[PDB]
Structures are given as structure tokens and as C-alpha cells.
């Protein structure tokens, strides 16, 4: 019945849940919470040539 | 090349201007093995509690300045840990690594020497006279050579040119040492391992090394340039063992 | 010097002010004036509790001439700030030597009884404080200017993080279309 | 059929063991010139334990900081009156007149997304000298009306037809009502700051709202009653979902003004403190 | 935790009683702490742009919603032999730990002649 | 299987009519782990100048005695190398090895309770009031329960049977706990680990646990037996843990 | 003695007391005001059926001289309570001998005719009775003292267990904030 | 569909219950009412020396 | 997609079938001083049936 069981948010130191889409749009299903992906250096790290942090920056 | 980073407990120094680090007869500090050991009871061994970078007072470099000495161990005494584990044990043990910094423009001149002397025993001003431990070791504060032949009761015989030991100045390069050239670099640093005749010693009682800075050029500029230019000493201790617990002493 | 480019320069000058500290803060990223308006205070005060390390970053704007070194320490909590060198020294600390690379990066290590603080700090989630001094002192040529600024730079380390979302105090209104 | 979706939680860096070091390798002098930021943790300083730290940045995505509804618009409207324009309420649609939601969404040059959109609707008794009276429960009516369609003219205009345009009808004492949007926009994704103009002669009107055009709201009484005046609110709250956003920017300082332009008033940096040493004292008996 | 709300209203004592009004509605806020604080019925701050709230309107099923568990440390402290500053004095026991909020409930018709 | 030997440190204690030894919970003390930390910085671990033995003040149990109790720590902050690790440092870590004794001839009776309790938040005797910090503790001096209810500002409600806490005291046996009995033993020792809600906390302002001693037969000799019959108390910290080094603080 | 320790201590002596009763109680773990403050009790209390085998244990206090036998009895239910050390020694009892080792165990086993009764016991679920008597007596040698007290303590078995949850009836209040 | 069958509470001397979990969030998930496991001897017997009980407990 | 998941129901110990007894063995003397609490059940002191308990915690 395409359905989908993935796991849920529990801590660290049975545990999934099911979901169905009823409607025809995708622009009626529920938010997209379970992601988390970074990639900084875009902001942080913007430079042409690498700095290696044990080097001297200049010279 | 020029660049140096040192990383020791909770406290990290950086310079730009280095030239090199001295270890001192290429040894470095250590620990007491067994088959070098006479005491018997467990030693303890706080190593990050204690072996960490801490910074005494400044000295104003002036167109007439003498020089300066300070004594290791006693200036550490009130240093927190270090101080505590000095206070509550009968017998210490540790090496160290000195830095010291002083930095000025591209107009300024002077060139210091920066020496460490294990056991600089002194001589009195009255030459049928003893010194009183006020005379040697102010603490965290330095005391200071005279340009002149000294006087006085129970003080130090200091005039810069005998180093206040009976030798010609000039030759203190035997021992390790370093030079700060204003136009060169603008740091010193040595790493002096543990240095005595037994393998542990009293910390109050026996004083190891002394640090001796001494301009032999003196500090000289030109018409509005900075006048105020500060000498600093950044000390930490390295692999340091106590045994011996029993009641604090006092003084 | 609340409204003028003043307010980010901290000032320093050559001759013998040993004696003098530099500066001196609170480490409080959300709640303290130094910080709550800076990019990493502004996210923190949509949040409730942080946690991670911090990095404070100090640049040397004189003029190619002058020397100097200072003395950067930080006190965890427990006991009062510091009121001379020699009691700083006894804390985190670094000794930094002004040269071709004009930048000194001082780390502030995540040193906590708990796993989160409060970005409403009180008493009890206290996290210490932060104080300069001069190591050797200032020195020029002739020539010179004898007065100079230092500033600085906050960010966060990459053990860092935040969570319990809350409404900000920073932004209000008394009634629509505003 | 049943198919397993795996997820990864991604946790937060370890610190590692470091020891003692003297060496030319200088981690912590650096050059922000180059606009560069240090990339140094507390292992290359000082002396440190392992650790193994297992914290989530979980909360802090974009979609767990934007999924939540507020409140954009309120309204009000009688079912008598002798105005004939204060029986319905209408307005423009945005996001621009409440300013929590405003802030949080401008730290955001672009954005893309769609929405779930929930009214809440509440009516009350007119104060009057003479109450008392026995009404069947209300229903409300709202009409959503893309640019160029028809505009009503009162209560009874032929234009609550409603034949393409989608309405809600709703009474109340039920739940309230909801409904979802697409993301509805001509460009390839919505703009909060516009540096232009409407006209190619670089004038006419500036800014934000040159660009936006996405409809009106229209809302009314169906009963057509009330012996004794009465008075209801609408509110309407919106919550993005499937969100996108690009080129952050530093957040709001000034207070806003209104809702056309970034027009503001000079304010402080910070407020002050004592000295550039001052810090209290906490540890007294 | 699961927490539920019962909510239940009054006619007030009067000489004149007799009125016609619609169900009333409740609203729930939940601030947690630094969060600003209403000061009436008509304040900003029931927008609850960020802060949880629960609408509710009377006739039926009581409220309903779970919590985590939330607090800075690794479990709730029911007794704290300790004090909240480090000279050993200030505020004693368990109100130095507890800080999770405060609750505010108003009605929402802004009504009622009697 | 009466003789008992513990060692730590320098420090070592015998005894010869002992009952056995009580492990709190079944777990013994043991130093933080990585996957439980969240202070980042390296602790320091001084692992025998801090873990060893030291003893308190003796009291005198007499014919009317109602019990006695301490709070742990801020009763060893002046025991050496122990108490000056506390006052250097913002966190601290330690579990204990507790140990008292009491020794009576054949011809005595008696029957004393000894118990640990984890986080002893105590009353005040005045309702609507509050205790003072001086009230709790008195650092190596024991505070004294009372046989009848309790006046005065700021001072700890102490009648004995309800233990300063609302309680039954009879209930107490609930915590760890031993008891000396006059014909039997003649002394008690308990095992306590770090029982906390978070892996570390400040020593200075957290009371983690009381011990109590509490006499529930009362002493009671006859003709010309000695009449004087002291207690003591011994505690010794094991695997002791520091972190966050800063400037000492006062009280 | 409500507020005394002296509540905890049952008192015994030496000479010719063959006649005296030591104590005697009733088995209701859950009621009788000797049981239902203990450990047990206020467990019993949130609940109303129990049922299993319960554990009194009876440790001597007196100098190590002096020596003894007690007679521990238990009646189950059924008849009056004994008057006398011929009568309880028909019942379920064990002769503790004072010794080295201070300590005895009396165990009272389930003997009921249900399978759980109402910890708010009635004449319908009753379970009977404990009693103490001399057995032989206390003697002493010169310089010691003559009366001695015992202690009693109480726990329940490895087959005990309660079911049907309930509300105490030992706290209370008058309002809120309490 | 990600169901869970499990067995219900009985007496002694069909029996089966499913379950689906709807919600993100574990904290939203019911009770955990069927978990009956002990440890008394962390109370009852917390000594460094094991002893028997049918031996002498000294000596 | 179904997933079965066992219960294992806990009750409480059964009592053993004792007989008359003449030996050293002494599981009632005890000391409380210890610390802890006596093991003993009705089987140790008296005579006693076998009993299938079947209750539950
Ligand atoms: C019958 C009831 C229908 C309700 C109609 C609601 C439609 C609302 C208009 C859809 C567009 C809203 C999406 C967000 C608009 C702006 O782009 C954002 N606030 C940011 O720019
Ligand atoms: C919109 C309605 C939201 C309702 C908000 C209810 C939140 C209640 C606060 C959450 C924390 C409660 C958990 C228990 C608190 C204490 O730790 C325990 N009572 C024991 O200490």
C-alpha cells in the first residue's frame, strides 16, 4: 500500500514509525524533518588557494 | 621558519619573529626512572595542573638599565598548583621551558642577552659579610644589577660587569643562553632539563637556576618614536613529581 | 562611543603601562552587551540552551614598525577576575608575539559541570571571564605614531551547537503594518 | 508493499587526546586579511582528554527553524452596519506586517518553499444597552482572489459565486480550518530585498513591492442576520514547508517602520558598560 | 510526559442573569524562559510566532499533547543539597534548578456583558 | 575473617573485629570516560597525594547522646593536597572509602547506626524560614542532633527521629549503611562512588552526601568500667578528578 | 514515647520472669500501627491486595556476657491469642539461642485460605498473631548491667507481591501551595 | 506497514494486539507497560564478601 | 510488513517440598551488622508442600 517505516529521533548513551500520503500533490505532505547536511567552508573557507591552518598564512 | 607555536596544558604561545629553541645540553626533561631512584613512596603527578605557561611581572627597558635576575624555584611559590604542591611536599622534581618577549619598531636599536646559570651562587657587599635571602629572590618581581660598585648591609655585590659572581660577564655565554637583537627576532626561548647532584631536592631550600637578562648594547631611538618598551618572562614547568605529603610549611 | 566605528577599537601605546590591564569581559555569548549582537549572539537568542567551544581572533592594526608582545588569558568560574598579570597567568592563557602574521587565535575550551548552559545565564551556569595584558610592552622608531588599535573576532568551533527554540526579545511592535 | 527509508542522524565532532609540543608549526597564527576564517580547536592549544560527544545539530536546519506557524494578518468585521464596507474584510497578501516572522525570514536573501495556511476565526456581542437574543451558530466565508479577478463591492455582490475562484465556508465551534499552497511565484524563487525599480527610466516604485502581485483575501458573514450588532476576527497564520534558502545576511538592528520600504532610524551599536575593564563581582560572603 | 487540560466555566452570581452567547474559546501559551511575558489580554505577544500554544473552544474532548524530556542535565533532580552561589548562600534546595518555563491561559472572545 | 587490611597512598589501617565491607550500589569507583564526558579540557589526576586516609575530630558518645553528622565534601577542604586541588579548581570528581571506629570492653553495651545519605536536604526549625550554610557544617567539627524539638533562626529542625529530613528514622536503612554493635565489632567502613545527575559539579557548592551516626541502644556500663568511649572517623577519596584551573577562591 | 527512640527498644532483664510476656502483635502488615509506617507498610499502602511470606528478624543488644533463650511463636488465625509460653508452644515458633552470631530470623509463611487478602484487613482476612517468652532466662556475671533491649526489623519474602493501586490515605492538604 | 504484533495479558491456569506507530517523534509513542525485569540484590545484599546462609555469618 | 515481538512474563518463585532436619547447617542465625538483609524462606525453618505459584509483579 506504499507505505514507508523509517526510524525516529530517540537519544543516545519498536523505534520506527509508519507514514501514508493520501492526497495527489506532493505540496500536501508533511514537512521534511529528518535531514541534516552542512557544508561551511562555503562561507567560512571561500579562498582560491587551500590554507593548510599549520603553516603560516602569508609567506 | 620564523613561525613557532607551543602548546603546554590549558595555555598556548605563538610567535613571528623566532630564531631557534635552545635545549639546553640536548637533553630534554624526563621523569625519575627506577634504577635512578632512592626515595620509596609513590609519587604523585598532577601533569596538566601544573605544567602549564604562567607569566610574572614586566620590566620597563630604560636607555640606562643594568639588568635583571630572577631565581627558579621561589618564583613559582604562589604560581596556584605549582605553588600548592611546593607548599605540601617534602621533596620536587621538574624541568622547564622559559620564554621571554620583547618587541619594538624597525627604527628602535638594543641587543639583550637572555641566560639561564644552574646553582649562580653570590657574593656580599661587604666582603667579610653574608646575604640575606631578601637580597637574592624578591619573588615574582625582579631585582636589579647596578652600573656602579655597591654598599650596604647584607645585600648583593651587583655591579653589572662581575655578574655579581666574580667572572668576567663576557664569558656567560658557556652556560645556555640566547640573543634578542632588536633588528632580528623578538623572543628567547630554552628548555632546561632538571639539573643537580641528587635525584630530587627541596624546593624551598635550594634554589636551581638563575635567569639573567643583560643589555649589552643599550636601547637607543630617534625623534617621536615609542619610548615605553616592556620586557616579559613566561615560565612553565615540565614533568613534575612530588612525594614526601605531610602538613604545609610556612615562612 | 555607542554610535560611532570607536566602539570596535580597542587602544594601546608604547611606554611603561605594565600596571594597566587591556581589556577584560564576561564570557556570556547571548546575554552580555560585548556579545548579544554579534552573528553568533544574534543566532544564540532564538534558542534556549548552547553548547561547544569558541574562538576569539585579535588582529594588530599598527604600522610596520612596532613590536609588542601580550598575554591573553582565560579564567573558568569559581573565584573574581583577576586584578594584575601574575594572578591571570595562573589561568588558559597564550602569549602572543606581534610579526608578519598579524592574527592570534585564542581558543575558549567548553570546560562545564553540564552538558548545556543557558543563553539566560545566572549564577549557576557561569562560564568565567577573559583579560589582556602587556607582556613586554609597545616599541617604535622615530617617526611613528605612539598610539595603535587592536580588534577582534568571535565564531563558533565545530563541537558547537544549540537547541529548545524561543522568540527573540530584540524585535517588537505596538500595533500592525510596521 | 512495504518500503524502509534509513536515516542519518549526523552528530557533532569529537575532541581527541593531545599531549605536550614544541615544534614550528603554528597553528594559531593566522591572517584574516585573506578573509579567511581559522579552522583551529582547542586540541591545537592546549592539552586535552578524549571525548566523545554524541549532540545533534538537529534543531538548528533550516526546515526544523521555519516549520512553525505565526500569526501575518489580522482583521475585523460587523454583520450590521450602516458603512456597507465594514461587513467583509479584505487585504493584500505577504508577509511583511508582523514583525516576528518578517525578521526570522529576512536573515535570507531568496526562499522558496511552500505553505499551510490556518485561520482562526472568533466573534463577539456588540456592547449595547439592550442584549439578549437567540442566534443560530455563524458561518464565515473566505475567497481567495488572484490578481485581475473581479473585486465584490459588498455582501450581496455576484462575485462570492465563487465558480473558479477557492473558497473555505466554516462554522463555528468546529475545528479550525487549514489548507496547503504550492510555491506560487514567476521568478525561481520569492525575494525579500529588491535593489530596482519598476520603470526602465529608473524610477516609479522601489523596492520589495514591485515584485510580489500574489492576490487578495476577502472574508464575510454568510448568514446575513443579527437583530443586535456583532463583531468577528480573523487571523491567519502561515507555516513554510519543503524549504530553500540562499545568501544569508546579517539580522535586523533597527526597529521597522512600515511595510513598503527598509526605511529606519539610526540606533546604537550595543548598550554601554562602566569601563573597558569593568567586570562584577560575584564571589562575596 | 503527557500532559491534558480540563477547562470548565461559570456563570457568574448576579441580580440580572439571561444572555445569548456563543461558545467560548481558550488559548494556551507556553513561554519558556527568557521568552517575553504578557502583560494583558490584548499584548503582542499572543502572537506565539514561536512559542507552542493550544486553541481550544468549549464542548469537546479535553486538550492534549506530549513533552520530551527536557533539562540541562542527565535526569530531573527531586532534592539539591546545595546552594545557587559559590560563596554558599543565595537561594537553598531545588528552586536553583528547576527553570522550565512559565504557562499563561486567557479567553479569546473578549466578551461577556454579564 | 574478622582482620581486615586497607591500603591507600602512604596510608594504611588494620582491624581486627570487623563485619565485612558494604559496596553502595554494587559499584565500585572508577575515572570518567570519553563516552560520558563533556568537559573538554585534560584533567589532572594527582593519584596519591589526594587518595589516601585522613581523620577528623573525635567525639565522646555519652549515656545521653542523640547522634552526630557531616557533610561531605567542605569537610576535607583543609586536608592537604586534597583541599587545595578543591580550592584551584571549577570541577571536581571523587568517591570515598569511609571508615569509624569505636572500641568497648565485654562489659559495655551499646548500638550505634552508620549511614550515607545522598543529597541530605535538611529543614529549617523556623517553617517559613531558611537555613544558613554554618548550620549544615561546621567543616571537621560534627553538627549535634537533639532529643526535642528545635528553636532559633536559621537553624536546621534536629530532633532525631525525624533525621532533619520529615522522615521515619527508623526508615534509614534503606540507604548504605552499617552498624556497630557493642558485642560484635567494633568498626564500620562503606564504599561510596560519585552519585551525581551530571558526570562532574563544584565542590564548593554542592553537598553530595551526609554521614550520620546515630546511637539507637543507648551506652550503658556498670560499677567502675571506663566511662569514657570516643568515636572516630577516617575517609579516604579515590579516584579524585579536576578540571577548569584558575585563580584560588575565598570564602 | 511516641517521639523517643525509646519507641524502637523492647526491654528484657535477668532474674525470675518466666511468667511475663515480652510482646505479642498482630499480623497486619498494612494496618497496625506497629507496621504500616515501616518500609513494607508504606509500599502496602498504595495498594490494596497482598500476598506472601514475611521475614522478622531479631537482633540482641546487650553486653557481650550476658547469655539467653527466647522463645519466637506464631499463631495462624482461628483462636484467641495465647496467654501463656505452654499455649504458644502449639503454634509455628523457633528457639533462638544468643550467641556469636546476634541475630535470629522468624519467618511467618502464607497460610490463608485465599490467595491475596486486603491490606485493609477485616475479621473475613485476618492472619493471626506473634508472641515472645522466656525460654530459659537472662544471666550475668558481676559488673555488668542487668536489663538489655532487643530490636526488630521486618521484610518481606522472595513470593510477596501487592496489586490493585490506590491513593494513601497518609498525606494531605487544605489548599494549594503545599 | 511497520505493525508490531505482540501478546496480550492473560491469566493462567486470539491472544495478540497490533500496534502502528503515526508520529516523527518517539516521545509521542504510548506506555511501556510490559517490561517486568529485577535486581534486588543492588538493596538487599550489597557486600564485597559473598555469604552463604547456611553457613555462620562470621568466624 | 509485520514483526512479531515475544514478552516474557515474570512470577514469582515457587516454594520446594522440606523435610525433617538435624545438622550444622544454620541458615537462621544471621548478623544484621553487615549490612544485610537474610535469604531465608519458609522451607529453611519449618516443614513445607511444593507449591506452583503462578502470581505475578
Ligand atoms: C480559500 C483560502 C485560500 C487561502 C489563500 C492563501 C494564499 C496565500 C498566498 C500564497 C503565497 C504565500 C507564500 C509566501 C509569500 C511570500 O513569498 C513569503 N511571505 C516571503 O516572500
Ligand atoms: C501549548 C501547551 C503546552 C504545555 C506545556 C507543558 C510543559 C510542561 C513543562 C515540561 C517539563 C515537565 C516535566 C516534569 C517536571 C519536573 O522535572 C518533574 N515534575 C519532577 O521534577
Not at chain 4, 587526546?17 to 614550528?24: E, M, R
Not at chain 4, 500569526?71 to 450590521?80: A, L, R
Not at chain 4, 459565486?161 to 479550525?176: D, K, L, R, Y
Request: glycine share 6%; proline share 6%.
Amino acid at each position: 500500500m506504499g507505505a514507508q517505516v523509517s526510524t525516529q529521533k530517540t537519544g543516545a548513551h519498536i523505534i520506527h514509525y509508519t507514514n501514508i500520503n493520501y492526497y495527489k500533490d506532493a505540496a500536501s505532505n508533511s514537512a521534511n524533518r529528518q535531514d541534516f547536511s552542512q557544508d561551511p567552508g562555503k562561507f567560512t573557507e571561500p579562498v582560491k588557494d587551500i590554507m593548510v591552518k599549520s603553516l603560516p598564512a602569508l609567506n | 621558519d620564523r613561525v613557532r607555536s607551543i602548546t603546554l596544558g590549558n595555555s598556548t604561545i605563538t610567535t613571528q619573529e623566532s630564531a631557534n629553541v635552545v635545549v639546553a645540553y640536548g637533553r630534554w626533561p624526563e621523569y625519575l626512572k627506577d634504577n635512578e631512584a632512592t626515595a620509596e613512596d609513590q609519587p604523585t603527578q598532577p601533569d596538566v595542573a601544573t605544567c602549564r605557561f604562567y607569566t610574572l611581572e614586566s620590566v620597563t627597558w630604560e636607555r640606562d638599565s643594568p639588568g635583571w635576575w630572577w631565581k627558579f624555584p621561589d618564583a613559582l611559590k604562589d604560581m596556584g598548583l605549582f605553588g600548592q604542591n611546593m607548599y605540601y611536599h617534602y621533596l620536587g622534581r621538574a624541568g622547564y621551558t622559559i620564554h621571554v618577549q620583547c618587541n619594538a619598531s624597525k627604527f628602535h636599536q638594543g641587543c639583550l642577552m637572555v641566560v639561564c646559570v644552574p646553582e649562580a651562587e653570590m657574593g656580599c657587599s661587604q666582603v667579610d659579610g653574608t646575604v640575606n635571602e631578601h637580597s637574592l629572590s624578591e619573588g615574582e618581581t625582579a631585582k636589579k644589577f647596578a652600573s656602579t660598585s655597591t654598599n650596604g648591609t647584607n645585600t648583593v655585590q651587583s655591579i653589572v660587569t662581575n655578574a655579581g659572581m666574580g667572572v668576567g660577564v663576557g664569558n656567560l655565554t658557556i652556560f645556555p643562553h640566547q640573543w634578542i637583537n632588536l633588528r632580528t627576532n623578538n623572543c628567547a626561548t630554552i628548555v632546561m632539563p632538571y639539573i643537580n647532584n641528587v635525584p630530587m631536592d627541596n624546593m624551598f631550600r635550594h634554589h636551581n637556576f638563575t635567569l639573567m637578562i643583560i643589555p649589552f648594547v643599550p636601547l637607543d631611538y630617534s625623534s617621536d618614536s615609542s619610548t615605553y618598551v616592556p620586557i616579559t618572562v613566561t615560565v612553565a614547568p615540565m614533568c613534575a613529581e612530588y612525594n614526601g605529603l605531610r602538613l604545609a610549611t610556612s615562612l | 562611543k555607542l554610535d560611532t566605528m570607536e566602539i570596535y577599537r580597542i587602544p594601546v601605546q608604547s611606554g611603561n603601562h605594565q600596571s594597566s590591564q587591556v581589556f577584560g569581559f564576561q564570557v556570556q555569548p547571548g546575554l552580555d552587551n560585548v556579545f548579544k549582537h554579534t552573528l553568533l549572539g544574534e543566532i544564540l537568542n532564538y534558542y534556549a540552551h548552547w553548547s561547544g567551544s569558541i574562538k576569539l581572533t585579535f588582529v594588530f592594526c599598527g604600522s610596520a614598525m612596532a613590536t609588542g608582545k601580550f598575554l591573553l588569558a582565560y579564567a573558568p568560574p569559581g573565584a573574581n577576575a583577576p586584578k594584575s598579570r601574575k594572578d591571570a597567568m595562573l589561568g588558559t592563557h597564550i602569549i602572543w608575539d606581534v610579526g608578519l602574521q598579524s592574527s592570534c587565535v585564542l581558543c575558549i575550551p567548553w570546560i562545564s559541570q553540564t552538558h548545556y548552559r543557558l543563553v539566560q545565564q545566572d549564577e549557576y551556569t557561569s562560564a568565567g571571564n577573559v583579560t589582556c595584558w602587556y607582556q613586554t610592552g609597545i616599541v617604535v622608531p622615530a617617526g611613528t605614531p605612539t598610539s595603535c588599535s587592536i580588534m577582534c573576532f568571535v565564531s563558533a568551533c565545530n563541537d558547537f551547537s544549540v537547541r529548545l527554540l524561543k522568540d527573540t526579545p530584540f524585535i517588537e511592535q505596538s500595533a500592525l503594518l510596521q | 508493499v512495504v518500503e524502509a527509508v534509513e536515516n542519518a542522524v549526523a552528530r557533532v565532532a569529537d575532541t581527541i587526546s593531545s599531549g605536550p609540543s614544541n615544534s614550528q608549526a603554528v597553528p594559531a597564527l593566522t591572517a584574516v586579511e585573506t578573509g579567511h576564517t581559522s579552522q583551529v580547536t582547542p586540541s591545537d592549544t592546549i592539552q586535552t582528554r578524549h571525548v566523545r560527544n554524541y549532540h545533534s545539530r538537529s534543531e538548528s536546519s533550516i526546515e526544523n527553524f521555519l516549520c512553525r506557524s505565526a500569526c501575518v494578518y489580522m482583521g475585523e468585521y460587523h454583520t450590521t452596519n450602516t458603512d456597507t464596507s465594514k461587513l467583509f474584510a479584505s487585504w493584500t497578501i505577504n508577509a511583511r506586517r508582523m514583525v516576528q516572522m518578517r525578521r526570522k525570514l529576512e536573515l535570507f536573501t531568496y526562499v522558496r518553499f511552500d505553505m499551510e495556511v490556518t485561520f482562526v476565526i472568533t466573534s463577539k456581542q456588540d456592547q449595547g444597552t439592550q442584549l439578549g437574543q437567540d442566534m443560530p451558530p455563524l458561518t464565515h466565508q473566505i475567497m481567495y482572489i488572484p490578481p485581475g479577478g473581479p473585486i465584490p463591492k459588498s455582501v450581496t455582490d455576484y462575485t462570492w459565486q465563487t465558480s473558479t475562484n477557492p473558497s473555505i465556508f466554516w462554522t463555528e465551534g468546529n475545528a479550525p480550518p487549514r489548507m496547503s499552497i504550492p510555491f506560487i511565484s514567476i521568478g525561481n524563487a520569492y525575494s525579500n530585498f529588491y535593489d530596482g525599480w519598476s520603470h526602465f527610466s529608473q524610477n516609479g516604485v522601489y523596492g520589495y513591492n514591485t515584485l510580489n502581485h500574489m492576490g487578495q483575501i476577502y472574508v464575510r458573514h454568510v448568514n446575513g442576520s443579527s437583530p443586535l450588532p456583532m463583531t468577528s476576527t480573523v487571523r491567519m497564520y502561515f507555516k513554510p514547508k519543503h524549504v530553500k534558502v540562499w545568501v544569508p545576511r546579517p539580522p535586523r538592528l533597527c526597529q521597522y517602520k512600515n511595510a513598503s520600504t527598509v526605511n529606519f532610524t539610526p540606533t546604537n551599536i550595543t548598550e554601554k558598560r562602566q569601563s573597558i575593564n569593568y567586570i562584577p563581582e560575584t564571589v562575596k560572603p
